[PDB]
Amino acid sequence: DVVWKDVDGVSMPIPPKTHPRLYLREQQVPDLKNRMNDPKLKKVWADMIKMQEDWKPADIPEVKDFRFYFNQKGLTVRVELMALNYLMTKDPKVGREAITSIIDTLETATFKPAGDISRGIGLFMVTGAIVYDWCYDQLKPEEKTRFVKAFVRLAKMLECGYPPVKDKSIVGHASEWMIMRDLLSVGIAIYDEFPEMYNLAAGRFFKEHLVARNWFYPSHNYHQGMSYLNVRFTNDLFALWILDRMGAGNVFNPGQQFILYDAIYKRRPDGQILAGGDVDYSRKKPKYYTMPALLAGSYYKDEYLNYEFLKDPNVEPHCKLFEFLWRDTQLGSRKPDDLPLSRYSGSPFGWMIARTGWGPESVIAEMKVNEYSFLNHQHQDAGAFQIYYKGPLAIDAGSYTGSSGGYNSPHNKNFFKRTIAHNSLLIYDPKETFSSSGYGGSDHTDFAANDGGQRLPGKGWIAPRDLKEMLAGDFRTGKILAQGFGPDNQTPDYTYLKGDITAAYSAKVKEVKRSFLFLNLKDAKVPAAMIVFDKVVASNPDFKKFWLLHSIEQPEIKGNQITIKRTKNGDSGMLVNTALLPDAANSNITSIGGKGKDFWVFGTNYTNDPKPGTDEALERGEWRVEITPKKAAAEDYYLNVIQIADNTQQKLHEVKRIDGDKVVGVQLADRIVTFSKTSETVDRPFGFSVVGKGTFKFVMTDLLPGTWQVLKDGKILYPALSAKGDDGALYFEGTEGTYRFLR
Amino acid sequence: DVVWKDVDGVSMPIPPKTHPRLYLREQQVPDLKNRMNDPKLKKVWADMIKMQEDWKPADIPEVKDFRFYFNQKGLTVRVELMALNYLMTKDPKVGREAITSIIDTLETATFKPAGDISRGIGLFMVTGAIVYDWCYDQLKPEEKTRFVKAFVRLAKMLECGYPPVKDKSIVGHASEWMIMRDLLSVGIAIYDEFPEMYNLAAGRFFKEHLVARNWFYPSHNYHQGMSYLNVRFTNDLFALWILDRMGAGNVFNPGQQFILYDAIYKRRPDGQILAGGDVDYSRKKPKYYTMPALLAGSYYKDEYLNYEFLKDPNVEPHCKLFEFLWRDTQLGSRKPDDLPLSRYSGSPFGWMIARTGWGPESVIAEMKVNEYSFLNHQHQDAGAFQIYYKGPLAIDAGSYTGSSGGYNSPHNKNFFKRTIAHNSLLIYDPKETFSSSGYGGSDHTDFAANDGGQRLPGKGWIAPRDLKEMLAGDFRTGKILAQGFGPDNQTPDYTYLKGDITAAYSAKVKEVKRSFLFLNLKDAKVPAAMIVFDKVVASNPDFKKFWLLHSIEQPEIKGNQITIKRTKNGDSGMLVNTALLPDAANSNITSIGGKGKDFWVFGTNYTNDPKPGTDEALERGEWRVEITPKKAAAEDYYLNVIQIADNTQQKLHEVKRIDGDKVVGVQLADRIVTFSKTSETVDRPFGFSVVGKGTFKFVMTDLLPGTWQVLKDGKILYPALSAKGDDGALYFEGTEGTYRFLR
Numbered sequence A, B: 001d002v003v004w005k006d007v008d009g010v011s012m013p014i015p016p017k018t019h020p021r022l023y024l025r026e027q028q029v030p031d032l033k034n035r036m037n038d039p040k041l042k043k044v045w046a047d048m049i050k051m052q053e054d055w056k057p058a059d060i061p062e063v064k065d066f067r068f069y070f071n072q073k074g075l076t077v078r079v080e081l082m083a084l085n086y087l088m089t090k091d092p093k094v095g096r097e098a099i100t101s102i103i104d105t106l107e108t109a110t111f112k113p114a115g116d117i118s119r120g121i122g123l124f125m126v127t128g129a130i131v132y133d134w135c136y137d138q139l140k141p142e143e144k145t146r147f148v149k150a151f152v153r154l155a156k157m158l159e160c161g162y163p164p165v166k167d168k169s170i171v172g173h174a175s176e177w178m179i180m181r182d183l184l185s186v187g188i189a190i191y192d193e194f195p196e197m198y199n200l201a202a203g204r205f206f207k208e209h210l211v212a213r214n215w216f217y218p219s220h221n222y223h224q225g226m227s228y229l230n231v232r233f234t235n236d237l238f239a240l241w242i243l244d245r246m247g248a249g250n251v252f253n254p255g256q257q258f259i260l261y262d263a264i265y266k267r268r269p270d271g272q273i274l275a276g277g278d279v280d281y282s283r284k285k286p287k288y289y290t291m292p293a294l295l296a297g298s299y300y301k302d303e304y305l306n307y308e309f310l311k312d313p314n315v316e317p318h319c320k321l322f323e324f325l326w327r328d329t330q331l332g333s334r335k336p337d338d339l340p341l342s343r344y345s346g347s348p349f350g351w352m353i354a355r356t357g358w359g360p361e362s363v364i365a366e367m368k369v370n371e372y373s374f375l376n377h378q379h380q381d382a383g384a385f386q387i388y389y390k391g392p393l394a395i396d397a398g399s400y401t402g403s404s405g406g407y408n409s410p411h412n413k414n415f416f417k418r419t420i421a422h423n424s425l426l427i428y429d430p431k432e433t434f435s436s437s438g439y440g441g442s443d444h445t446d447f448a449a450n451d452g453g454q455r456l457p458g459k460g461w462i463a464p465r466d467l468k469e470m471l472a473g474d475f476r477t478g479k480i481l482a483q484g485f486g487p488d489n490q491t492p493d494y495t496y497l498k499g500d501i502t503a504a505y506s507a508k509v510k511e512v513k514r515s516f517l518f519l520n521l522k523d524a525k526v527p528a529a530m531i532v533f534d535k536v537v538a539s540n541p542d543f544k545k546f547w548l549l550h551s552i553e554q555p556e557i558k559g560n561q562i563t564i565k566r567t568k569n570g571d572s573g574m575l576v577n578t579a580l581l582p583d584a585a586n587s588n589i590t591s592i593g594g595k596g597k598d599f600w601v602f603g604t605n606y607t608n609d610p611k612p613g614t615d616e617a618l619e620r621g622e623w624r625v626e627i628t629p630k631k632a633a634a635e636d637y638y639l640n641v642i643q644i645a646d647n648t649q650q651k652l653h654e655v656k657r658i659d660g661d662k663v664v665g666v667q668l669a670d671r672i673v674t675f676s677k678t679s680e681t682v683d684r685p686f687g688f689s690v691v692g693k694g695t696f697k698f699v700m701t702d703l704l705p706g707t708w709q710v711l712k713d714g715k716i717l718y719p720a721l722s723a724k725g726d727d728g729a730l731y732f733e734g735t736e737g738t739y740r741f742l743r
């Protein structure tokens, strides 16, 4: 019903010649009365009634924060509910009171610089847009011109500016409320009197924002960490609902529906969410994605997401109207318990989440490649793994906020966002320059700490404008080489991911590969294991290599055995790493941490203590383990086997390294896993021997896709098995004996 | 133990400074006494004794083709056995007799031009080389000179010439005995005196022959059809054995072991092999791959291939010595019964073979893409399917020889090797030329008939010299888009292949795609089905489109139904095709055949009656069906459902077309298969309805790889299933309802 017209090569929907067209059209208006009589939505309307009352004079902070405005009270709430009333009743004097109440305060409103003050401005513009569109037929010619002028005056105050030519389109402040809700709403409201605003705001959205999001949406994930996922995705979902309710349909790739499934997978038994990107920690109250769950759940009619909403069905005051207008109260809700235990996020991510269940005894493991880096709140964490079981065991260390400061802090710039903070790999070139010239909006530094980790992409560690700039730049940080999970879809025995993350680092490396193999052991005593096989080729043999494993508490290093426990905050998990490569004759295993060394980076420690009453579990981490070769060599391999059990467990599984023909592997429990000795495609016959009792489950990786023949003890076991393209692997059951594989 | 020194960027092994080095080294000489006393090899040793006798003067053909020589009798056998005796006994005078018995004849021998005379010349050279190498320490210096001289003289007579600069390195006469057996053997023998012959012959083998073969070998198939597979693969294996026995190890990609598995899959219950490329037919004696089964089975110690050899352990006379020297008589043998019922051959083939069993009641079906065309004995058959069940049903038409002539015949040029002879697709452009000037060695012809079919690649329909030339030229005919079978490896419910064969045709088309889905119905009444879905976009809407189905006996057409039966030669299978697209209002179904029309190509019948006493079942065919749109259009679609059963089966499965959202499919028995309506990737939600009792097995194709969600009747059925890269498909089970799919 809306007309699509090409603008500058990009097709755009023209706002329809009717009012209302903001958040609803006239066809939805009669249903507002039915929503009014819906008991589930009576409470939210009753909440808005209470919000009409002004702020109490003794409660008004001295710094008028973005939180102050989002905890919406007083006049603007009164004019929205009055506008809602006109929408429903059409009584002219109501439409008049709403218009008259706001017009003056709108054209003369002032905002004193504060934390994210564009959000208070933008919300105040939205109140205006609501009045202007909903009460349109009661507007006077002079008033139409007054509103428009006030909007332009307010629009100039936003961080993105007006015209909105400033900031970034994939990340940053311009990927939040200001364009995708605030400027978009106003533009739609005033299109017939002043078309310019929509044209520039929706113009930038369609040209840049939309194109970028539709590129990564098919892989069903977000890139800004597990905290900012809220403000970033919520605003993606506002643009969805707004453009749809205008009559433009769903502009986004429908893969948008499954984005928040990642958070469902990342949920641990204590109501907290697995770490990733710029995050803080807490153990007081569970973390919720209320608004994104509300908006996506109700648009796509998804019961898993709606279940996530109904956990804490309480939105921010300034979003109460949108819940009132948009919530689907008839949609059912689904617990995550019937979902498959592993889930894969493809290009441009290459991420795996593997679980052992959905109950309190759940191992939750993450494995990451990162094919691209989006910057902002993303960390340079290519190759990182992270493991939870009754407490965070292998952790994504550091904190976003603390004694060091905020986003700006020399801790974010030197530890938290850097590879050294994560369970990945370091290669130390003492001459390497890390340009950070563009990072942050203040306290700007030209160079950052050399952590031996991954590059700082962009014009001095700054995200690109749009996808076009991103694809032509230097933000590529890896390639997914292979992936898959267990023979069964629902309850996979194995979950496999492999990446080449060479392009994440500088030319100091010739090649960096990492293969992850998570095993669900289907056992109460030792529920899961994780095999990590790494290949690192340095450009100079004298660039010291590091394998990192971070923890909260201090690890026990006993030979090639690392043991990490949880014994605080009710956490009782345990991680035990068996270091298989390099050889015992070539491995040094040093721990570094505790006070003064907790955030250690090659000379300087970047302290960041928890702000009072926050992060009571110290999930920011205090310790890390470093595995290094004894000999200076260009080419090294790491092979570590992690086992997971509760701290109450004495005897785990014996870990045996398989040294075979062309392959290297691991045997534990009833599982056997092999990799190419050189971590390259195996395109020729290979073999190895297996000694042990009972039936084993075999996973052979790095294989040339095609038809393989498996021989055991000189005889045909399997005459023909197909190794497929996506995993490049063979799976089968067999007993002890000498195996040969033909291709 | 041999040294490899690089010649022209290509590493080449140097013959060791020791004798013997031809066919064996000194370390296997002691084992010749053991072989002598082997109860299995004493029959072949007695055979060679019998072969010492000259041709009875009555029996001499006086047109002496290759067969006269290959049926080796007389002097050449005598001197080889004398050489063999010298090897085992070292009695100097025996070495002397071997040399002096052959030297004069080797200098003086003449060869009248006849059918493949180079084969006799080469064999005579082999005889000379045996004496030379095995009796080397008995040669006088002057005799070496004489031998060398005689070898060069004889070499000049070979089709490849000397220097061996003529003919092709992948196909043709130079891919037979002349270089890979004969020149190579002589070069190895005389290397210390005349290193040139080995340098040039092995030069060309290592630079050209080997490179080409190692390129396609990983996909475990051959390109010259099911007859010339014998001579061609036999000679590959001679080179394997000769160089290995020289001490160079295995120069080939070990995937060479599995090539002959293709013949195993193509064996019918009547002892014949499924047609393909240049073949003739017989019901009189079974076809055997005796020599390649012997050489590959014995080298690779493969019991499936050795089984193939033992069906008829009867080697041609000239090969008897090689059986004596090389056969492994301890090796076991396995029948094919435990092999998986489907086998895939990847790039550059893209060929699926699918069966329902290994016995008399098995269906055998073949599906082909063809990524490249090798020419010579390969047919222009991209997209062809072939079905056998209790007789050839959906056939591969024409015959190699008959009343038209041999290889150079009008039948070969204008029908047999052409697309119209195959169950594939025609697009008739009345102005298209088919340049054939290079084809064949005699009776050359500038143009071949317009069959509405695929291009004639190369420079006048002639193969390129080597791989370098092949990749640079116009030999690409297809791209494999997707393939797979399952859900079980051993006995798959379904077998799937998709190709884009646009490149097989001239610019008269913009797009040609073919998807095959073979269904093993696991059904007593209808053992199998095949669905074929085609997309064809013509450059001119008026270029008439044809979908073809060849049969031996006359098909019955009733509305959208074609019935093909076998009722002769003890054959009793039946084929029933349901034509689903184009629909009735846009479909013309016609049959062409019977006397004068068996080999019809737009105005002309290319008659090729059987040679008497041959093709008793008339597998060359007499009939075809053509499905053509009623309406001229650029873009058209074919959808055809073939059911296979006994010719006495009255009731077959009802076939229904599924017209969904974004997809089109088929429902028959308990099976549901969908395709993209445009044969393109489905990257958005889609759906369709299912009506019917019971549980159905779904196979959805053309899907964007990643995590899909299945809903039935508005409810989640499967919260998450993964479509994989190689097949781009979802498989699951379900009952009737309205299905939606989310990605």
Ligand SMILES: O=C(O)C1=C[C@H](O)[C@@H](OS(=O)(=O)O)[C@H](O[C@H]2[C@H](O)[C@@H](NS(=O)(=O)O)[C@@H](O)O[C@@H]2COS(=O)(=O)O)O1
Pocket: A116, A168, A171, A172, A173, A176, A228, A231, A375, A376, A377, A401, A406, A407, A408, A440, A441, A442, A443, A463
């Ligand atoms: O909404 C955010 O992205 C965000 C909220 C805060 O403004 C700030 O976090 S903090 O209060 O804990 O310090 C932080 O804003 C960043 C912003 O993400 C950066 N954008 S980017 O350039 O695209 O990466 C940038 O603008 O800097 C802001 C804070 O830096 S500061 O103002 O110099 O302190 O995250």
Ligand SMILES: O=C(O)C1=C[C@H](O)[C@@H](OS(=O)(=O)O)[C@H](O[C@H]2[C@H](O)[C@@H](NS(=O)(=O)O)[C@@H](O)O[C@@H]2COS(=O)(=O)O)O1
Pocket: B116, B168, B171, B172, B173, B176, B228, B231, B375, B376, B377, B401, B406, B407, B408, B439, B440, B441, B442, B462, B463
């Ligand atoms: O071994 C063969 O490939 C082959 C043997 C025969 O010489 C002939 O078969 S026939 O007697 O049934 O006609 C045929 O030889 C072909 C040969 O394969 C062609 N090679 S190619 O150019 O590389 O494709 C070519 O040389 O033509 C021959 C036939 O013409 S002729 O030699 O003049 O008889 O197949």
Ligand SMILES: [Zn+2]
Pocket: A276, A277, A278, A379, A381, A396, A397, A416, A417, A421, A422
């Ligand atoms: Zn991090």
Ligand SMILES: [Zn+2]
Pocket: B276, B277, B379, B381, B396, B397, B416, B417, B421, B422
């Ligand atoms: Zn053919």
